[PDB]
Amino acid sequence: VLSEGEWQLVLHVWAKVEADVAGHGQDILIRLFKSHPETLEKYDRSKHLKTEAEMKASEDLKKHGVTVLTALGAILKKKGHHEAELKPLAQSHATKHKIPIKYLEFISEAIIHVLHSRHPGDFGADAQGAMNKALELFRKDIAAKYKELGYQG
């Protein structure tokens, strides 16, 4: 679905993310909450964080961003061959957290924004197109798994 060149652009910028997983995850979650505040409702503890500085100071949020980006990176590195990595994520996000696909679109937008903000020289139009294809594939495949579990979000 992605070409080998597209996967290489995805993994090239992902290596830059991995130089500071925690900082990238903080910026991505903070961007998600500021652009789409309704998403913050899904987090029992984090939803009580009232300012950007509190969000940046939160060890809980920082640890969570690392968990999120580690899971996403493990999926991306499979270059589409991600059933085993995607299934447990679909299970929890469909049946426990109840995260609609539109919220995965919102976080994909935040990922793109932060990648471009931090790595513009390694995240031009072709690299952005490749990352958008990879995240579109992630969202398509997770939506199919959602439906297999009975969730139409």
Query: 93 a known binding residue?
Result: yes
Distance separating alpha carbons of residues 57 and 55, to the nearest angstrom: 5
Contact status: 43 vs ligand HEM (CB under 6 A): yes
Contact status: 33 vs ligand HEM (CB under 6 A): no
From residue 107, alpha-carbon distances to 5, 47, 84 in Å are 24, 16, 22
Check if the beta carbon of residue 44 is closer than 8 Å to that of residue 142. no
Contact status: 78 vs ligand HEM (CB under 6 A): no
Contact status: 107 vs ligand HEM (CB under 6 A): yes
Q: Among the candidate windows 5-13, 67-75, 76-84, 112-120, which touches ligand HEM by CB under 6 A?
A: 67-75
Distance separating alpha carbons of residues 153 and 99, to the nearest angstrom: 7
Contact status: 131 vs ligand HEM (CB under 6 A): no
* Closer CB to ligand HEM, 29 or 121, in the complex: 29
Contact status: 90 vs ligand HEM (CB under 6 A): no
Distance separating alpha carbons of residues 120 and 62, to the nearest angstrom: 23
Contact status: 48 vs ligand HEM (CB under 6 A): no
Task: Pick one of 39, 61, 65, 76: the residue that binds ligand HEM (CB under 6 A).
Answer: 39
The token duo for 117 is 């903000």
